[PDB]
């Protein structure tokens, strides 16, 4: 059944230029720039065209949708082939994603440390040895079965470290210490094992199919949108760009039904808000993550 399609009433432009922003609390400056506001407004446009086609039956699978997001994002890359290939390629089962918690991901470190669901564990490291780490272990539940996802760790014996790290550098050379930190920095996100991605993809086509219904109340539909956005962003299915892509999909599904969601709230980097939360936590909080203030 065809759907109303994108709204005619459209976010004021101050908002459209925030669509997709990474409005880090600790440096919203980058949200304020000309090039970005260009990037975001581009996104807001390719979303809506995609919405147009969802509402008509042109996008059938969440995989075809994700193609529409991927396609868009690359067209915004002025970088080169080693960078074009990552944003274009699905993460595969013979590899492990990692994100060092450096900058701009320095705000996160508090979010893990004061997280109510945070553990206190030990990270056994061949160079620093044994370390205290506050740990969050995002998990998802599906068909009943538990899925582990991303794993936030923050080393806390911070004085040892700066002392230890300086130690280690002169021996192995910066060359071989950076090697370790690229893969074993004490503070780091260890992402959803790529092996889960086959099934997480079926579940996301199931989820998309339902939300392109025509009978859905305003509450459900959103509850569907928040989920999709949660599952994509948290599985991080592509080597690069998953963050944008996820938000692209979600917002395209919203405009299909004629909804015109706003930019997320400042300091609410949506992918990370979803990585540090369970499914139903995030479904509930979704509405307030959006700057729905007049």
């Amino acid at each position: 059944r065809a759907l109303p399609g994108p709204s005619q009433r459209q976010l004021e432009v101050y908002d459209q230029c925030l669509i997709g922003a990474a409005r880090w609390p600790d440096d919203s400056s980058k949200s304020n720039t000309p090039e970005n506001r260009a990037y975001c407004q581009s996104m807001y446009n390719s979303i809506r065209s995609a919405g147009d086609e969802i509402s008509r039956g042109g996008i059938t699978s969440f995989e075809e949708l994700w193609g529409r997001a991927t396609e868009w994002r690359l067209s915004k890359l002025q970088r080169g082939e080693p960078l074009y290939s990552a944003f274009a390629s699905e993460r595969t089962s013979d590899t492990d994603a990692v994100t060092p918690l450096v900058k701009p991901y320095k705000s996160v470190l508090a979010r893990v440390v004061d997280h109510e669901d945070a553990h206190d564990e030990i990270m056994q490291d061949n160079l620093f040895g044994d370390l205290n780490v506050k740990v969050y272990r995002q998990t998802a539940y599906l068909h009943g079965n538990v899925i582990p996802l991303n794993t936030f760790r923050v080393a806390t014996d911070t004085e040892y470290l700066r002392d230890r790290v300086a130690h280690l550098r002169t021996e192995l050379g910066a060359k071989a210490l950076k090697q370790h930190l690229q893969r074993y920095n004490p503070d780091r996100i260890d992402h959803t094992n790529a092996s889960y991605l086959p099934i997480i993809k079926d579940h996301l086509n199931d989820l998309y199919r339902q939300a392109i219904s025509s009978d859905l109340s305003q509450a459900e539909l959103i509850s569907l949108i928040a989920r999709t956005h949660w599952w994509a962003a948290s599985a991080m299915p592509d080597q690069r760009g998953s963050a944008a892509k996820a938000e692209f999909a979600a917002r395209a599904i919203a405009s299909a039904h004629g909804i015109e969601l706003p930019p997320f709230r400042n300091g609410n980097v949506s992918d990370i808000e979803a990585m540090l939360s369970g499914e139903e936590e995030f479904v509930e909080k979704y509405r307030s993550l959006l700057d729905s203030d007049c």
Partner: peptide, 25 residues
């Protein structure tokens, strides 16, 4: 004690903050 992650000051070997991809050991 330093801030969390501020143990990694002025190190030339400080990681680059973005998603990396390695071979499964």
């Amino acid at each position: 004690a330093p801030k969390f992650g501020d143990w990694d000051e002025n190190n030339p070997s400080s990681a680059d903050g973005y998603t990396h991809i390695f071979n499964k050991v």
